[PDB]
Swiss-Prot record:
Membrane topology, as annotated: Multi-pass membrane protein
Catalytic reactions on record: Thiol-dependent hydrolysis of ester, thioester, amide, peptide and isopeptide bonds formed by the C-terminal Gly of ubiquitin (a 76-residue protein attached to proteins as an intracellular targeting signal)
Subcellular location: Host endoplasmic reticulum membrane
Domain Macro: 1-167
Activity: how regulated: Inhibited in vitro by GRL-0617.
Oligomeric and partner information: May form homohexamers. Interacts with N protein.
Organism field: Severe acute respiratory syndrome coronavirus 2 (2019-nCoV)
Protein name: Papain-like protease nsp3
Function field: Responsible for the cleavages located at the N-terminus of the replicase polyprotein. Participates together with nsp4 in the assembly of virally-induced cytoplasmic double-membrane vesicles necessary for viral replication. Antagonizes innate immune induction of type I interferon by blocking the phosphorylation, dimerization and subsequent nuclear translocation of host IRF3. Also prevents host NF-kappa-B signaling. In addition, PL-PRO possesses a deubiquitinating/deISGylating activity and processes both 'Lys-48'- and 'Lys-63'-linked polyubiquitin chains from cellular substrates.
Domain of life: Viruses
Amino acid sequence: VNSFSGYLKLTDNVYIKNADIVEEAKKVKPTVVVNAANVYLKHGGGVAGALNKATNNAMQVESDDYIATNGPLKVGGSCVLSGHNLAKHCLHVVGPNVNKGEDIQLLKSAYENFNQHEVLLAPLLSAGIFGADPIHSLRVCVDTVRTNVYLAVFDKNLYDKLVSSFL
Ligand SMILES: Cc1[nH]c2ncnc(N[C@@H]3CCCC3(C)C)c2c1C
């Protein structure tokens, strides 16, 4: 039993809710919140911009030190950093950004990072400003993640379409 509330159950391990991931993280304080990161951990917009704003830019400060030490992530890769005031940990996961020409096949690799964590709060990878079809992202999530994932979908209209079209 965990503290996630109001989710529709899609499969044995995948749950979904129309929610602002920032407000959901602040309420649940999950062990792991997933960020929709880029390889530079530049949290300017989309989910990343919103999460970073909620940490008062502390996420960005930590991220800049990480990059200065380690260099950029790989598309499809991830790193674990602090969750600041939102979660114990933040798993920064880089899905392919279609608006940069990146291979959508890397979306499966991106979701594989979730399997290293028993329970996660997460957005749909490569959705929103990353330009992929959120319906496809949900399909890849369901077919790749085996651990317990609680998906937050900001847009109510998109949430309803994802549910109604789910196979
Ligand atoms: C402030 C905020 N909180 C969120 N929580 C979850 N998902 C979000 N965006 C999704 C990602 C992919 C599709 C979408 C509807 C843009 C958000 C945003 C913008």
